């Protein structure tokens, strides 16, 4: 059987698209839940909006992880490539993508609750940030795995 069949690029394209799709769904949900919390509470306390906006920024970063992996995978696509490269950069796509989705759900829920509560207990804001960092790195772990796999996609490959 050939090492480089004609359908090999397919798993590359799916991996490339999957990296940004799932990551965007995570960032979208994190933005939505946080946005409702901010708008609900800042009606009575407008002076602290630009402090409470952090969860939206934190969710926004996750989309950037998907973008860079998607771009790095994209520039490795070619017409003739080993099937091994296809599977590897499919795995790179899924690992960051569905890790971003997981981190997105986490930021959305604690971001909403933290903002909702902080408006009547000023000491709680530092707690919200501290928890959000633990949620944030769940995306970062996905990125590290994706970049390790991607680096391995094209070295010592014969075709």
């Amino acid at each position, epitope marked *: 059987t*050939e090492l*480089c069949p004609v359908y090999a690029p397919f798993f590359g394209a799916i991996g490339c698209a999957s990296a940004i799709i799932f990551t965007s769904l995570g960032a979208a949900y994190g933005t939505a839940k946080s946005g409702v919390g901010i708008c609900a509470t800042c009606v009575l306390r407008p002076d602290l909006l630009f402090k409470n906006i952090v969860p939206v920024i934190m969710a926004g970063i996750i989309a950037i992880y998907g973008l860079v992996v998607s771009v790095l995978v994209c520039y490795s696509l*070619g017409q*003739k*490539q*080993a099937l091994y490269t296809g599977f590897i950069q499919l795995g790179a796509g899924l690992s960051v993508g569905l890790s971003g989705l997981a981190a997105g759900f986490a930021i959305g829920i604690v971001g909403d609750a933290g903002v909702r509560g902080s408006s009547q207990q000023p000491r709680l804001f530092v707690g919200m940030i501290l928890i959000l960092i633990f949620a944030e790195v769940l995306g970062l772990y996905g990125l590290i795995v994706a970049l390790l796999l991607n680096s391995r996609a094209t070295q*010592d*490959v*014969v*075709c």
Partner: nanobody, 115 residues
Framework: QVQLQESGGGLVEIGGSLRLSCAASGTLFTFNTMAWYRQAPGKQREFIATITSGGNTNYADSVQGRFTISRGNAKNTLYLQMNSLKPEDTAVYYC???????????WGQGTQVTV
């Protein structure tokens, strides 16, 4: 695009020696097979030597013994070391890179060597 270029062309004394070099860039894989071809003026191309990704070699009897083909350490690089030249060696030389299947067969522009 994938592209190749040779190097090391020139002119030398009879019985002398020199090294030809070739490389490729922009590729996503190690070529299964790479080879050298020779064209003296007024004649068709001659097969000189070839070497697989694993180092398996084959030569034409016209260069057997006199020439040594070798892989470089960087992916998709060749060095051809030719010694004990004779005037009949005057030719342009090309390096060729080939995939195991499909139309993906590449050729450089070639370079000149003379006595």
């Amino acid at each position: 695009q994938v592209q190749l270029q040779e190097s090391g062309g020139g002119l030398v004394e009879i019985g002398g020696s020199l090294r030809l070099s070739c490389a490729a860039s922009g590729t996503l894989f190690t070529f299964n097979t790479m080879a050298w071809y020779r064209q003296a003026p007024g004649k068709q191309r001659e097969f000189i030597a070839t070497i697989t990704s694993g180092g398996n070699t084959n030569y034409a009897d016209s260069v057997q013994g006199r020439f040594t083909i070798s892989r470089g350490n960087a992916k998709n690089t060749l060095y051809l070391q030719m010694n004990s030249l004779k005037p009949e060696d005057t030719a342009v030389y090309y390096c060729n890179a080939r995939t195991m299947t499909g139309p993906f067969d590449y050729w450089g522009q070639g370079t000149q060597v003379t006595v």
